[PDB]
């Protein structure tokens with residue numbers, strides 16, 4: 020009934036690789052946890068909400084010595100909480116104030132591709148800016164924004180470009196849940212970085228099988244501590260490393276109630292003392308500190324290494340509210356042969372999707388919008404422990420259902436919608452996919468060095484009432 | 496603890512189930528700034544007595560952005576000002592009539608001597624003439640209101656534009672933690688439905704015996720109302736002052752409403768909810784909190800899927816949040832036994848009848864000794880079969896009462912506090928606990944005003960056993 024173990028096949032974990040790097044608990048002061056500021060609108064005129072977002076340089080005190088040269092959204096590093104609302108329209112002004120081209124990929128949002136998507140087709144030259152419009156129609160969930168150029172996605176994210184996104188659909192939201200951002204409701208944006216005189220050098224730490232960093236960050240903070248002012252606490256976890264798998268445990272094995280995955284809430288909640296997330300996998304979780312006095316620390320650790328210390332303070336309210344046994348209604352009853360097939364293969368430099376690398380001008384698949392197709396994403400690495408690797412399939416422009424893993428029921432927290440799934444070596448994952456808008460989307464391994472090296476294919480979501488010519492140019 | 500994500504009353508008997516119901520049309524005008532009713536300044540304070548003058552008058556109000564709209568109003572063109580009382584005080588009121596027909600001043604909420612001070616259908620003020628009245632006030636901290644209650648034009652007159660919010664602060668039960676800065680962190684939300692004929696209100700045209708409905712929603716006589724929130728906590732004093740329309744208040748972002756009070760003062764404990772339903776005259780004081788909102792973000796409040804008020808978040812000047820006690824007000828509720836009174840509300844359209852009889856102004860329909868706690872059994876004999884039924888709100892003059900039971904089950908979560916107006920669903924027996932404090936003749940009537948007019952009104956005598964006053968009843972109607 021209670022889960023006390025990490026989910027994916029241990030034999031293929033990251034630490035088996037020959038160029039892994041353990042996390043080093045840094046000898047710095049416990050820093051206070053940085054909450055990303057809420058992005059105010061520039062104006063509201065109707066059902067349209069206006070947003071401006073500068074991607075810009077800056078210097079951030081992360082260590083207690085020098086500043087660190089960082090890139091960031093509307094800031095020095097990282098980015099603000101960008102709230103959307105299902106059933107609204109949004110005009111965004113994407114300013115580029117970096118010295119190289121960037122994009123704005125809305126990892127989670129189901130908006131037209133490839134321009135709004137912010138995939139490798141929506142470049143913004145330095146100095147220049149861009150405007151975009153899109154409706155939003157999807158469930159209540161946590162998304163995020165990262166650059167997705169070609170082929171420098173990895174470098175950019177490393178530099179410090181990431182930002183949490185919150186998409187509240189009034190129709191499936193639970194406002195019982197802690198919603199006081201910063202107090203009872205916080206992000207946990209896990210990242211791994213190496214410091215060279217308090218500076219991040221991507222070129223130095225680069226590895227084509229995934230760039231690892233010896234120090235863990237949390238919302239751009241190191242040795243982060245957070246004072247819990249309230250009994251319930253909703254963490255919105257996110258692995259935004261380039262490769263590192265996030266193995267989240269606690270030093271007192273506090274029960275984590277996972278209420279949501281990437282693409283919205285789970286049918287039912289899932290209690291567990293530990294959790295593994297691959298790159299870009301989100302998890303919304305609830306902890307309860309009723310049975311703790313004041314001053315008691317609860318350390319959260321990536322693997323062996325502390326990353327966030329939850330210090331119990333004087334509770335101001337009681338913010339515990341009854342939840343429904345069924346968090347969200349989802350039809351899962353769908354059988355039949357897969358009408359699509361994705362064969363992820365190779366490691367290091369052998370990374371390829373269905374034998375091919377990425378061609379920006381090519382369409383690699385087509386699927387009618389609105390229809391429920393079944394995909395078969397697989398991984399042909401060596402299952403023999405140590406030989407294998409865990410690739411996470413991400414798909415733009417859609418949330419999908421995990422139906423099965425090699426015929427068997429998916430892990431207990433995979434019944435809810437997902438836009439990012441882990442694929443173990445020798446595993447056939449069968450997904451149920453439906454595209455709501457039309458347009459060109461990507462599907463790619465979300466280890467960002469694999470993406471850069473061509474583990475990226477495109478799909479056209481076709482409207483049957485508007486066959487569209489796509490004139491797609493290569494940009495690299 | 497749970498969060499209420501639903502209205503309360505039986506959906507099968509909602510207003511929209513009427514054959515000739517009218518959906519609310521969002522009117523196509525410019526967003527208007529919400530009109531806050533000015534404070535009623537005293538005319539003089541000498542001692543424990545505060546002097547008040549109130550002219551009911553005509554005028555012309557800019558509601559739509561084209562032509563003016565002929566309105567009736569208290570000390571103004573439309574509606575009226577915030578009238579403040581204070582428990583344990585005496586008040587001399589000069590009620591001036593500057594209308595072209597007879598009106599009264601019914602103080603809906605106040606527990607003052609009937610039927611002259613009450614402003615019931617016995618306290619007419621002929622045009623041009625005026626009246627003076629004296630009364631103490633001794634009741635809890637609560638939101639009341641003033642509407643005209645003549646025979647039988649109560650409905651017409653309210654429609655013309657006669658209403659006013661009333662605030663009664665008893666020092667003994669008042670919570671000064673709560674936002675008290677009227678116009679800033681503390682505002683009314685007087686919901687009214689009206690139809691415009693070339694920017695003009697025609698009651699006669701829109702009249703229906705089963706309740707007059709209007710295609711446009713007003714809020715403090717404002718249309719497309721916006722209000723700038725200059726502060727984190729905001730205390731709305733919600734009031735349905737329509738003739739029939741039931742106010743189903745919801746938000747498109749499901750902001751939690753913490754109900755602190757009902758009609759007759761505060762609730763024992765606060766009640767969080769994302770939605771709420773109020774029948775006519777039912778008042779609800781609620782708290783919204785905008786902590787988790789940046790600046791510029793709109794929060795729409797809508798009546799049954801039609802916006803009525805846009806709360807725009809502005810630059811907070813203060814933090815006005817203050818910890819509230821788990822118990823907002825202590826109330827004895829433990830009271831058993833057989834009902835010593837019975838009210839049988841029956842009929843729709845013009846079948847409206849209390850215990851089989853219509854309204855007779857010269858007849859006393861019941862008697863109860865003051866001070867004592869009697870139990871009533873208000874009920875409704877409409878058809879429970881969905882569609883076929885109607886929700887009648889029982890109002891009683893001169894008293895606040897406690898809802899004990901609804902068909903033997905506990906009352907809705909926000910009905911433990913005192914009330915002067917209760918909804919009665921079809922097939923429902925509501926058992927109330929009532930006590931009159933002053934003596935005098937009071938009404939009890941359905942507060943759909945076109946029923947009150949057709950004659951869904953009965954009278955009760957509140958009898959002082961020690962000092963009876965002989966009652967001779969004459970009809971003006």
Ligand SMILES: [Cu+2]
Pocket residue numbers: 124125126127413414415
């Ligand atoms: Cu994405």
Ligand SMILES: [Cu+2]
Pocket residue numbers: 124126165299413465
């Ligand atoms: Cu991504």
Ligand SMILES: [Cu+2]
Pocket residue numbers: 124167413415461463
């Ligand atoms: Cu991507």
Ligand SMILES: [Cu+2]
Pocket residue numbers: 370410411464465466469470474
């Ligand atoms: Cu890969």
Ligand SMILES: [Cu+2]
Pocket residue numbers: 601603642776890942
């Ligand atoms: Cu009334």
Ligand SMILES: [Cu+2]
Pocket residue numbers: 601602603604890891892893
């Ligand atoms: Cu009354």
Ligand SMILES: [Cu+2]
Pocket residue numbers: 601644890892938940
């Ligand atoms: Cu009345």
Ligand SMILES: [Cu+2]
Pocket residue numbers: 847887888941942943946947951
């Ligand atoms: Cu009635």
